[PDB]
Amino acid sequence: SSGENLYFQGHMIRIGVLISGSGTNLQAILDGCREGRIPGRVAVVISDRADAYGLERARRAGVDALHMDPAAYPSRTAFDAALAERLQAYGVDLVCLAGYMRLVRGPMLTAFPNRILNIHPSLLPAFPGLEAQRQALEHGVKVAGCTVHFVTAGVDEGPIILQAAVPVLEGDTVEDLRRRILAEEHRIYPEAIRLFAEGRLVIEGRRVRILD
Amino acid sequence: SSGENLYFQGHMIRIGVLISGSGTNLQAILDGCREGRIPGRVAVVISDRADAYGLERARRAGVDALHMDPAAYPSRTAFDAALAERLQAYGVDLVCLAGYMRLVRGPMLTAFPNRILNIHPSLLPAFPGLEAQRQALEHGVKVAGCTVHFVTAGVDEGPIILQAAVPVLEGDTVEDLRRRILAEEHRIYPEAIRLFAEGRLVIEGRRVRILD
Question: Tell me, what CATH number does A120's domain have?
Answer: 3.40.50.170
Check: CB of residue A108 under 8 Å from CB of residue A80.
Answer: yes
Contact B52, B19 (CB under 8 A): yes
- Identify how the structure was determined: X-ray
HSE of A171 in the Cβ direction (CA atoms, 13 Å)?
A: 3
Which of A67, A120, A139, A186 is the catalytic position?
A120
DSSP alpha helices (H): ranges in chain B?
A: 24-34, 53-60, 76-89, 106-111, 132-139, 174-197
Query: CB–CB of A141 and B123 under 8 A?
Result: yes
Asked if residue A17 lies in contact with residue A52, where contact means CB atoms within 8 angstroms, the answer is no
Is the CB of B165 inside 8 Å of chain A's CB atoms? Answer: yes
Q: Are strands B201-204 and B207-210 parallel, antiparallel or unpaired?
A: antiparallel
Give the resolution to one decimal, in Å.
2.1
* A124 interaction partners in chain B (CB closer than 8 Å): 141
A125 in reach of chain B (CB within 8 A): yes
Name the 3-class secondary structure at B150: strand
CA distance A200 to chain B (A): 12
Containing structural domain, residue B190? 1-212
Q: How many domains does chain A have?
A: 1
CA distances from A156 to A21, A83, B190 (A): 19, 20, 35
Q: Do the beta carbons of residue B82 and residue B108 sit within 8 Å? A: no
- 3-state SS assignment for residue B50: coil
Nearest CB to B163; choose among A143, A170, A206: A143
If one counts every other C-beta atom within 10 angstroms of the C-beta of residue B2, the result is: 6
Residue among B142, B143, B206 minimizing CB distance to A140:
B206
Q: Residue B25 annotated as binding? A: yes
Of B153, B155, B98, give the one whose Cα is nearest residue B129.
B155
Beta strands B40-47 and A116-120, pairing class:
unpaired
- Nearest residue, CB atoms, A208 vs list B125, B140, B207: B140
Long-range contacts (CB closer than 8 Å, 24 or more residues apart) made by A37-40 = A37/A190, A37/A194, A38/A190, A38/A193, A38/A194, A38/A197, A39/A9, A39/A11, A39/A12, A39/A13, A39/A194, A39/A197, A39/A198, A40/A12, A40/A13, A40/A14, A40/A15, A40/A93, A40/A94, A40/A193, A40/A197
- B141 and A126 within 8 Å at the Cβ level: the answer is no
- The answer to whether the annotation marks B103 as part of a ligand binding site is yes
d(CA B114, CA B204): 11
Confirm if A96 and A161 have CB atoms less than 8 A apart. Answer: no
- Contact state of B123 with A126 under an 8 Å Cβ cutoff: yes
**Binding site members of A:** 23-25, 76, 101-104, 118
Active site residue A186: no
Q: Return the number of CB contacts < 8 Å for A and B.
A: 67
Question: In chain A, which residues have their Cβ closer than 8 Å to the Cβ of B208?
Answer: 140
| Closest of A66, A81, A72, A184 to residue A123, by C-alpha | A184
Helix axes A132-139, A174-197, angle to 10 degrees: 120
| B209 contact residues in A (CB cutoff 8 A) | 170
Q: Is B209 on the interface with A (CB under 8 A)?
A: yes
Contact B142 A126 (CB under 8 A): no
Q: Testing the interface with B: which of A119, A135, A143 to mutate, by most B Cβ within 10 A? A: A143
Q: Nearest chain B residue to A168 by CA: give it.
A: B163
- Distance, in Å, from the CA atom of B135 to the CA atom of A53, rounded to the nearest integer, reads 40
Instruction: Write out the DSSP string of chain A.
Output: --SBSSS-BTT-EEEEEEESS--HHHHHHHHHHHTTSSSEEEEEEEESSTT-HHHHHHHHTT-EEEE--GGGSSSHHHHHHHHHHHHHHTT-SEEEESS--S---HHHHHHSTT-EEEEESS-TTSS-SS-HHHHHHHHT-SEEEEEEEE--SSTT-SPEEEEEEEE--TT--HHHHHHHHHHHHHHHHHHHHHHHHTT-EEEETTEEEE--
Q: In the Cβ-directed half-sphere of B154, how many Cα atoms lie within 13 Å? A: 6
Number of H helices, E strands in chain B: 6, 9
Which residues of chain B lie closer than 8 angstroms to A139, CB-CB? 125, 160, 206-207
Residues of chain B with Cβ-Cβ distance to A138 below 8 Å are 207
